[PDB]
Amino acid sequence: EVEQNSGPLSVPEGAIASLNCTYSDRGSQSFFWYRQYSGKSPELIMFIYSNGDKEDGRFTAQLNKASQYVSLLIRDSQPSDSATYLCAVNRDDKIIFGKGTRLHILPNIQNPDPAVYQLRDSKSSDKSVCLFTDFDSQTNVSQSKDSDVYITDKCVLDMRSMDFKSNSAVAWSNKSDFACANAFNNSIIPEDTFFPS
Amino acid sequence: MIQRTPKIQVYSRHPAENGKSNFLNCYVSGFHPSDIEVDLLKNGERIEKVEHSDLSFSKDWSFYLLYYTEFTPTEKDEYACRVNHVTLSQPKIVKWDRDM
Amino acid sequence: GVSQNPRHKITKRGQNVTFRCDPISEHNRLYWYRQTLGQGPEFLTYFQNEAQLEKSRLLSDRFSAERPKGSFSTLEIQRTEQGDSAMYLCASSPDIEQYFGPGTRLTVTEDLKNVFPPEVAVFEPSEAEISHTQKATLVCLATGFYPDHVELSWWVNGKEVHSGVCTDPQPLKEQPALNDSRYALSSRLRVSATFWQNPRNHFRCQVQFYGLSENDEWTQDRAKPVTQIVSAEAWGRAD
Amino acid sequence: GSHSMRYFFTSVSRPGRGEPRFIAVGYVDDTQFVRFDSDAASQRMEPRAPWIEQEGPEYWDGETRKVKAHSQTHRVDLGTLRGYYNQSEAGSHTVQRMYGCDVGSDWRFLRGYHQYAYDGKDYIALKEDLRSWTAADMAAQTTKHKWEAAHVAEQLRAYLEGTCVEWLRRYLENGKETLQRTDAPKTHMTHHAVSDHEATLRCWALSFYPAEITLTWQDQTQTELVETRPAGDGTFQKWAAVVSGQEQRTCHVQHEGLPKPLTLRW
Amino acid sequence: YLQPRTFLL
Ligand code: NA
Ligand code: NA
Ligand code: NA
Ligand code: NA
C-alpha cells in the first residue's frame, strides 16, 4: 500500500509541529500515528477512525476519508517529541507504514556564543578534537567533505539544574595538517565565532 | 442447535401450457440447519439436469434455496419435489399442482 | 509485552539466521516487518493463529516464517546476503492496532574479520571554554567499531547521568563509500567550571558494543570482538 | 425508491468430513450479484449479475482476497464459539453473519446492519446507532467486551456509512437498467369449486420486481397466503386465496410498480 | 464491495 509522509522538519520548542499523510486505498478504515525514537521501535501515539479531529493533550489528529488524508499537529513542541513520526494505514488486516517524517525540536538559544575550541585527550595529549558550540539553532553544520576530516551533526544537551540548553558539533582528523580554524570551513558559520589561541 | 422445518413450494416460472417449454421450480425456505436434500421428480424418477441457487438466509437466520429445471409440460406427466431434512421423520414429496 | 531474541545479530554472508518472537498472550494476529535507517517498517508476513495468511510479494524464497502453536514465531533467513542487514521487527495485535517488539538488529558481513570493537577516548575541556563561559565540555569519541550497534552512557562518580549529555543520533562512516566501513560516534557531557575544577570528580564514558558470542569461531591473532563494554575516564582538574 | 446492499455469510463445521463450508452471497436489493462457495472449483469470487461482469481484474482479485479472509476469520470464529460454549470438537456448528447498508430515494445513507447468529440463535448485532452492541447471552458479552476495547463499531460505521453507500451507488448506476426498474405484477383470478356448496378464489400476482407486495381480500383477513417466491428470472410471484355461490361479492393488489392499486373481481 | 477489515469473535 502506498502511504505518503515527507522530509526533515525543524520546529522550535513551544511551536506547533504539523505532519501530513495520504493513503492510496479509499477502502481503508484504520489510521494511526506511530512515533519512533532513534534505536527504538514504533509506539502508537494516536489512532483515528472517523472523519473529523481527535484531540489528545497537545496532539490533534485529523482524518479526511474523501481526500484520503491524515494529519498530526503537536501544540507546544517539547524535546521529547523529536522522533520520526510514522503514518500507518490498514491494507485489509495489516498495517502498512509510510517512510516516516523526522521531526527535530530545536532549543531557543537566548544568547548565542558561537565558539570553536580544541580539546586535548586525557591519556595521550598528541590526540585532539575540535568542538563547535553555543551556536544558534538556525546554524547548520555541513558534514565531512574531506577524506581525513570527520564532522558530526549538531545536537542539544540540557543542563537541567542551570535551565541551560546548548547546541554542539564535533570535528577531528587523523592528519597532522589539521587546525580548528580550517575544520568548520565547509559549514556556513558566523564571523562573530570566537576562535581562541 | 434449533430446528426449523422447511416450507416447500412446487411451481412453474410462467403459466403452464402443454407443449410450451418452461421452468419447474422447488423453493425451499424457513429451514435450519442448512443440510437439506432436494430432488425434482418426473413420474417418480429423479431428474438429473437440476440447478440451484446459492445458500442464503432471511432476517430471522432461516435458510432458503431455489432448485429449478427446464421442463415441457404435458397432460399425462406428473412432477414433484422430494425434500429431506433432520426435521422430517419421512422425506416430504410435494406434487406440482398447475394452479398453485 | 512483545519480546524478540536475539536483540542484535552478526552473521557472515552465506550463513543462516533464526530470530524468535514472543507476542502478547491473547493476540491472535502476528506480523513481521523489516526496517532500514531513514525508512518505515516494510511488511514481510502475517499470521492469524498458526496460519500464515499473507506474505510480501517482493519477499525472497530465502525468508520463511513459522508460528507452530499459534504463539511464539520464528523468522529465518537462509544463505544471507548483505542486503538482508536491517532491523527485524515483530508486532502482535488483537484486532488491527500493533504492539511492536524491541527488534532484532541484523548485520550481514563479507567476513567476520571485518568485526571490530570500539576504541574509546575522553577529551578534556579547553581553558578558553572555562574562561569564556564558566562551563566545561568533555567530549567522548568511540572509533573503529564494526558493526554500528553501540550504546553510549556517561557515569559521574559511579552514577549514570543524562543532564548536560548529548550523543549523536547515528554513528558516522570512517570511509563512506566502502563495503563494511568501520564506524565512529561522539558524545558530550557538560558540567560547570566549578564541577570540572574539583579533582575528586570522576567522569566515565561507557560504550556497550554488540559483537560475537562465546559459541563463535575465532582464528585471528587479535582478541575475539565479543559483546563488551569499552570505557575511557578523566578526573576533574584544578589548573 | 430506497435501495440496499447486503452480504450473507454461512460457515458450517464438518468435524468428520473436513474443513468448514463457507458460502458468501452478495445482493443489491432483491438481486444477487456475487457468490463464493469454499467447495466450488474456482476458489474465486464469482459474478451472478451481468452488470458486475464489467468490473476489472483488480475488483475480482480484491473481492476474492477479502472473501478468503472472511472465510479464515469465520473458521477461527467456529473454534472460538466451540470454546465459549464448551462444545466438543465432534459436533457440527453454524455461524451466520450479515452486514450491509440502506440508502433512500436521495441515495444517502439510511440504515446500517452488522449481525451474527450461532446455531440459529442471535449472538451479537450492531445497534441502529452504529455505536453499540447487542450481545444475546453471557458468551456473546465476551465478544462485546473485546469489540468495545478494540473500537470495532467506529471502523465498521466507517464502512457502513461511507464505503458501503459509495459502492451501492456505483452498483445502482452500472446496473441501472435492471436494478432501477419496476416490473408491475401481471395479476389474474382463478376459480375452482371445493364442494357443491362452497368455492375457492385465487388472486395471482406474477412477474413483479421488487419482491415487496401486498395482496388483501376486501377488509377480510381470516384466507390462504403464500410466501413471495422467486420465478427464477429475477422476478417474483405470490398468490392469495379465499373460500359459496355468491362469490361475486374482491382482491386488492398494492405494489411499487402500480400507479393506482389494482382491484380484481370474478 | 466486501469490508476489508475482519473482526475475531
Ligand atoms: Na515558540
Ligand atoms: Na476534519
Ligand atoms: Na467508489
Ligand atoms: Na468484515
Author numbering:
A (entry chain D): 3 to 29, 36 to 58, 63 to 68, 74 to 214
B (entry chain B): 0 to 99
C (entry chain E): 3 to 29, 37 to 58, 63 to 81, 83 to 253
D (entry chain A): 1 to 218, 223 to 226, 228 to 248, 251 to 256, 258 to 274
E (entry chain C): 1 to 9
Give me lines lifted from the publication on this model.
Here we report the X-ray crystallography structure of a T cell receptor, shared among unrelated individuals (public TCR) in complex with a dominant spike-derived CD8+ T cell epitope (YLQ peptide).
We solved the structure of the YLQ-SG3 TCR in complex with the HLA-A*02:01-YLQ to better understand how TCRs recognise the SARS-CoV-2 epitope. We solved the structure at a resolution of 2.6 Å with an unambiguous density for the peptide. The YLQ-SG3 TCR docks diagonally above the centre of the YLQ peptide with a docking angle of 73°, within the range of other TCR-pHLA complexes. Interestingly, and consistent with the strong TCR bias observed for the YLQ-specific T cells, the TCR α-chain is contributing to 67% of the interaction, with the CDR1/2α loops contributing to 40% of the total interactions and giving the molecular basis for the TRAV12 bias observed. The CDR1α loop stretched itself above the N-terminal region of the α2-helix and forms a salt bridge with Glu166 via Arg28α, as well as hydrogen bonds with the Gln155 via the Gln37α and Ser38α. The CDR1α loop runs over half of the peptide, making contacts from P1-Tyr to P5-Arg, with the side-chain of the Gln37α inserting itself between the peptide and α2-helix and interacting with P3-Gln, P4-Pro and P5-Arg. In the same fashion, the CDR3α loop contacts a large stretch of the YLQ peptide, including P4-Pro, P5-Arg and P6-Thr, and inserts a conserved CDR3α 109DD110 motif in between the peptide and the α1-helix of the HLA-A*02:01. The SPR data shows that the YLQ-SG3 TCR binds with the HLA-A*02:01-YLQ complex with high affinity and a Kd of 2.09 ± 0.16 μM, at the high end of the affinity range observed for CD8+ TCR.
